[PDB]
Ligand binder design. Sequence first.
Ligand SMILES: [Mg+2]
Ligand SMILES: [Mg+2]
Lengths: 100, 66, 196, 138, 101, 132, 154, 131
Amino acid sequence: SLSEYAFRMSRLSARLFGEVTRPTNSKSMKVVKLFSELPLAKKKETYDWYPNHHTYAELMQTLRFLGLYRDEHQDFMDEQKRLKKLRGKEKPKKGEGKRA
Amino acid sequence: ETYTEDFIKKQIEEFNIGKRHLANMMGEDPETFTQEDIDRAIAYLFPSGLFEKRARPVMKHPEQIF
Amino acid sequence: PRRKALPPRTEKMAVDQDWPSVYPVAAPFKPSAVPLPVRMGYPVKKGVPMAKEGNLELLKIPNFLHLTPVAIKKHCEALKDFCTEWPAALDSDEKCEKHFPIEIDSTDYVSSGPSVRNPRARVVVLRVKLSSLNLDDHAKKKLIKLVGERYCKTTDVLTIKTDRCPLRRQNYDYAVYLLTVLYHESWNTEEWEKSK
Amino acid sequence: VDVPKDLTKPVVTISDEPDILYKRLSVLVKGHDKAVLDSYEYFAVLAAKELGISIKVHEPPRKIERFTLLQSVHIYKKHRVQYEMRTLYRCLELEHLTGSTADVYLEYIQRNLPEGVAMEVTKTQLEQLPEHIKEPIW
Amino acid sequence: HYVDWRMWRDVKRRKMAYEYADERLRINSLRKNTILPKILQDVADEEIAALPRDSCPVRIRNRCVMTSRPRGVKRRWRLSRIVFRHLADHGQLSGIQRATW
Amino acid sequence: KNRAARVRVSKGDKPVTYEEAHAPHYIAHRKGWLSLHTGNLDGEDHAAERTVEDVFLRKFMWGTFPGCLADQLVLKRRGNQLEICAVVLRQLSPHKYYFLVGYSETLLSYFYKCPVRLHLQTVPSKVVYKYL
Amino acid sequence: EEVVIPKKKTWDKVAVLQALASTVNRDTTAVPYVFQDDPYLMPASSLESRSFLLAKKSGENVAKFIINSYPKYFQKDIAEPHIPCLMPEYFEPQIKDISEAALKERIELRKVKASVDMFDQLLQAGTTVSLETTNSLLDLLCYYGDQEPSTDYH
Amino acid sequence: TKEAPETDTSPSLWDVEFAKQLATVNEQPLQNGFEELIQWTKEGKLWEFPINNEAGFDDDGSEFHEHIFLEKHLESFPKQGPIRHFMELVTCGLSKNPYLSVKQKVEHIEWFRNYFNEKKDILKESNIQFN
Ligand SMILES: [Mg+2]
Ligand SMILES: [Mg+2]
């Protein structure tokens, strides 16, 4: 719906501003979009969604063994596990469960 | 929280000394430093956006506080 | 015997001291160093706002004790040696437009965190009035059709916004490149233009 | 009595390269606390006057973002808790200053940016026409 | 040391999706157009379908980073509604408050 | 009945601090925030990362100064600086406070790759606002 | 008409901070800045003034000992621009081959014993060791006297 | 005095250690808050002001024309046909991508060049000649 003058003027502006110069349908224009941005899996919000739970847990476990961090929750779990041994409720050995 | 007269007499001595310190911080004459200047200086030095004004920083004469 | 805490050093301060030396830089509120009987906190019934000692509400405030009017005036006196003088000939905006027809806009973002990066800082905006360019009747007509909506007839300003390069210096060099190829193509006359 | 005798001043070198000319510097600060922006405005304005910079101030309209969440950990859909984040603004507009004056002023007020306050500084630079554009090739 | 096994599976999915992102992107570009021959696009369909299942980004789930709750999560903070409220209601989230109007 | 962050009435023998004595609906009205950063402002990013860091710092300090903290931490961020303001008691010897300050500041600086500072204000006892 | 643009002024990255620092003097009511500004933590004598700083430096040594002992906990780099001075240090040689290039690594790390052993084995094998490297080994032995430099903990 | 210095002099252990003894004679604790900021700035811990969001990040010294003009990298592909049309859309999208370095953009283009070489037989069936 454009004159030959307008069509040639639009192709000229596309070459100067670095747009697609050949006639391309809407489907094929998805190729331009795909390479004009980062894939979702490559965005920092995606691959760094979680904090490294291994680092935090391992660091604070080490600091506790070094005597520099007091883990009240872990101390609570240790006391409960100690009193369960005295009560006879101890974890069985692998392969030596109640079902053998 | 009962407040004796010897306690209020000490609070007034602190307010007069602190009033001359505040005038010294803002570079104003300690003699003509009014309560309106105190409220303005405190709002600048300790900016608080709390909606309730009664919860914002205040430096008033003890007679107006206790 | 247990360790007895010393009395606060505000009791040693003179009312005519140099306060900027006490709070030279931004620091949290310290009751033992601020000689003001300031109180804060919504009081209980027939009570008073809590004193400053152990007052967490005064600790939450970003105080300006390091920026008293006395300190600011001494700071600015030492920063004058770093400044340069604006040209007196450029007295009005119309006079700046005459000698400097191009305007370049860029933005810097200051946030808090470990990383200073911000993708919005790469954007560059170049503005120029076509009246400032050496354009004849044909060139100005062809330039307006090439840029499209980048030109505003009301203001007669051409706005070129570039942000496809990672850096700002690259988007700036690209904005100048675009203005250069647009200017030289507007002066060039093709044969298909005769069919207008 | 125990005062320094002579003070070493930082070395400021006058270069041979021309300086940048800024038509405008639009300093937009954002925060949650209006009183903190009031104190920062007073500080920034007083700093600009002492350095001889022409500055204007205005307050863009605030923004309040609200969202809704369930109140119970389980069921009870018709009971919600609503939260909001208030963003207050203050715009310092400085005009007709060189690049050296802008670097000193911005460094001074950016270092003293209170916690919880962000800044977006838009700089409008004045440039001359590139030499290739002053005339057509033919 | 992740919250549960379901979070650990999502951690591995995000890692594998990141490693194959470039390859999947390049193969998908061959499929998302009407320019290349069908014979070449049919081969590209088989190639991307042969990649590991956990490289597909649609299998990633935005779970609460502290409790692994798979729903009711606010994307901006990556927290479930319950954990978010706990921090907000104790004044530990900068600038967040209860809304009344 | 609402429960969130409410110290419930008792027999008049429970001391509560100013922060503990105010329910959530008083945030921004009678009490401020315990952390200040730009992450939650309109158009700002990285709010999720700042939040995880805050949660960790509070647990780290609680277990690093066991039985010493007399109030919640105040976390402040300016530029890439991190300031931690804590109100502690006067039971530990000063030598141990200086050790823990030098230790925690150094460890946190290397963990979050930023200059961290810890400001301590000591009190003889937990400041009581009221007895619920 | 012509306008004269002023010449640009340049300064170092700390010049502005140094200009502001020149405006303040020492606070006579305070203890040195290195101490915690708190009436309970301030040193009350010349003995505490010395021991409080040694306790703080001791805590910094313990933190560095942990950072260098468990470097994998401190390798997540979130800083931009990068801060090299906040990364773990690696004092162990990473080249396990027996050659000249492997000896030069143990000389830079100042491993007196390992460097001598690497030199003996390298020499018994008959391989040539450059003169510049032989001198770089004497500089290490002649300086520390064939003894291992001090470390944090073994 | 020595008119010409030895710029390339090796830092022997005796010279590196004597330079540390000269850093100890001026070793004093920080006297105030400004000196702590100055020290952190020299060490690189503290940001430099005024803030530059691109500080310490130059994309390999690349010029704008290296990101925007990528047709020089399509010299190995056919000059006409569907493969040229397809690669002009790839390079068009890559020239608008500010999140990739020039090195990464070439990696994309190099991948397609190798991919179309392995599919030469399939392309010949469709009357397309890729090298
Ligand atoms: Mg899904
Ligand atoms: Mg209800």
